[PDB]
Amino acid sequence: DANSALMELDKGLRSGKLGEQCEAVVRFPRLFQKYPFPILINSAFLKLADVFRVGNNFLRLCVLKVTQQSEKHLEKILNVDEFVKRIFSVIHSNDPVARAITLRMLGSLASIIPERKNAHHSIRQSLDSHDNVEVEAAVFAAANFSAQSKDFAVGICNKISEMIQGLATPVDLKLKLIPILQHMHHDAILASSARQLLQQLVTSYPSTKMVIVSLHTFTLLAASSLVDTPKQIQLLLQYLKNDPRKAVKRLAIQDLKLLANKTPHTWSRENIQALCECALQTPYDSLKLGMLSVLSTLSGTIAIKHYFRSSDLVKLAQECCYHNNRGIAAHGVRVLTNITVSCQEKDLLALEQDAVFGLESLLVLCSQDDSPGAQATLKIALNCMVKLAKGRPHLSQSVVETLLTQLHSAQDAARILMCHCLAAIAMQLPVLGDGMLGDLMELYKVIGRSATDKQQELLVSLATVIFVASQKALSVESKAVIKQQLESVSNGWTVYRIARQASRMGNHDMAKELYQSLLTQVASEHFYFWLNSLKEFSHAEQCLTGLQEENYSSALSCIAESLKFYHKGIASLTAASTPLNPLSFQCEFVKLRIDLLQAFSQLICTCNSLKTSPPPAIALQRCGRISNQMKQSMEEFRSLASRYGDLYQASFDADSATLRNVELQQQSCLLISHAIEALILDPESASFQEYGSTGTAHADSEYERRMMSVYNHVLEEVESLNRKYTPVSYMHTACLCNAIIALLKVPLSFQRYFFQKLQSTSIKLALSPPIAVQNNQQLALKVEGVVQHGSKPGLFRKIQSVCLNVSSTLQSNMTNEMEQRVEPHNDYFSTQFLLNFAILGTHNITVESSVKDANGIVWKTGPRTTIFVKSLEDPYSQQIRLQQQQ
């Protein structure tokens, strides 16, 4: 029990022996962790303050440690007055150490008790004491209170001004005193006075340590108070150009880096001009590197647009990209990359070649250095050329060419990073050239007997670029790849990742071969079934590759065979599900794929039925059977689209790529449905405005681009047949089944969330409840749920507000319908609902939970928890009702 533990811990505090006392004191925060109950926290802190008052100095310091650690819990203190009063009493002790500990205690407590005048006066008094420990404690407490309070801030600002101006203060204490001024951002005039004070400081104390501290404090103050940021940047540039000391210059670099990271837009053209001039003039490599890092950080924002041709920045960037030092070259080429991508001015198009060639030079420099700094510079250069290629395709071709030329002679880690960069290049830009594939295959061959330890990641990355490059099917080169794998790998995990990439890029035959080869290595049950299911899905998709244009019999045959393999695969997959990591997304995705293929099979069957079931002689109702079958097909495809949308809403944890893939599947379903509608059911109602910029969309994957291309082709095909034929013409079914086989021609691509799941978040959804309640007293149910997270909470999404919806029904009707939106508010929400049950009997209470993200999208994620409640009345009400029922 909470109170039992509290007093069992308390008896240690009263033990007298110091060991047990300090043991209990440091045991207290764990008790707060177990029981965040404000009653317990209040009582415990009162006991803490009592023992702090009466105890010796070491016990007081232990209580100080506890107070500092228990920061999150102390805003729930009820009797703050008594607590701080008995804490404050120790400040009158003649023992300077006790006064210092009390000052530190008040500083820790400053969050819950600002604007307390006696505490402020105690801080102000101790600041001018003689004992250095008390003075340092007073400085710390002043920092905290000035962070919290406002009037205290201006008072301490005045006192610090007259103290630093004074001569009694030693140099070290002056150093400790200056960063107090970083909290003077409470109002404009106070900040301006602090700025005048800091100007006085830098003028009249020019030695290294305190100019360092003072101008860093000025930087923080300007960052907090945005009014004086331009003059602060101007002052920093002045100190960078004029001051000769290396340390002061390096601090200026760091402060400008902070300001660039925190407010790039405020920078002016003059500031960038001055920084570029400083970079050009200085001869030291380290200072140049740092200020070019600042410039590069600026270049990756809107500062370039505010800056604007050939100017100081361009000349500096060109000069630095060929500098000997690796870091300077990296930052210079990044500046050139940013300036080229950001704007399309004529001089930029002229100098874009310079950026590319400098990038190649950096690549050849870093291709064999093999050091962590070299790895970082190589990563920077590869990211820069990926961005440049995303901006400049005609440059991207030469980028690909030089990447392939340097791939062969590069080292293993350099090859891994180069392959990652090339994979990004190929994924974003489709027309990479199949001439790449020969070089990659040749490189893959020689690497087969290269090493054993680092060979694994190089192999998987090389296989990834092979699959991404092969937009079409494979050949005997796949046989070479699998032979090399079987001969040299002997690891399996790399085989699994290569098969996973194969399934990702649609090379499903390779995936089938690898999964079949890999089945024996596994040891568990669910993993064995999962691998078998992946093998069967790969086989089913490799069956899909047998389609040819305009052949519909073979198309139906392939669809049926793929349905057989898919059913075997889904049986194996649903055998693999376990309570730990239940394969929910995979099961639902495979079910929807099977249902879509079944819908295509039935639609092909109806297109054949147009000639197989001629219209009755009794008889656009002439082809009655075909009309009814097309109605059923439209219903089935609409339901399939709705279920794909439901899967989309349920897949909140999934990444962007998986969501886009599911959206593409739903769009295919909607395309088939709309084609059915326009061609058969009502071409008059088909007033489509499809004419637009659909083809100009930026597709992020080859599969997505092909899907959009076939969408556009089918849509323009439908429009040409809008009115040109009778509603049940053979051309309609011909175009429809042509669209079906065209959609099925491209291979299905899996995504991250199918294999690897991140951002795992669920809702416990506790509540306050086989249940019954009086009908007169309407039910009030309190619900609350902790929102669990796994590793990074906000990786892709960020839950901005929980949405709760609850329903009531009898015979197990929708009688209690209301929606509530509540924020997590420290990742644990709570609220209540009021429900009524007029009907006596069995009532089911279904409560649903939905998640609203930062973008405003509504996601149906949480548990579909349901509870049963019985409805009944009290005895005397029923008795009087029966008696008066005349």
Binding site: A376, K379, I380, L382, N383, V386, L417, H420, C421, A423, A424, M427, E457, V460, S461, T464, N491, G492, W493, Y496, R497, R500, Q501, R504, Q521, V522, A523, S524, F527, L580, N581, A657, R752, F755, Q756, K757, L758, S760, G790, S791, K792
Partner: peptide
């Protein structure tokens, strides 16, 4: 810090329980 490829699957700083057991199973 920056990453060369954003959609790279080989990033294994965060390994889920399924992949944790799967790696340990056959290595």
């Amino acid at each position: 810090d920056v990453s060369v490829w954003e959609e790279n699957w080989e990033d294994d700083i965060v390994q889920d329980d399924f992949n944790q057991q799967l790696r340990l199973e056959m290595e």
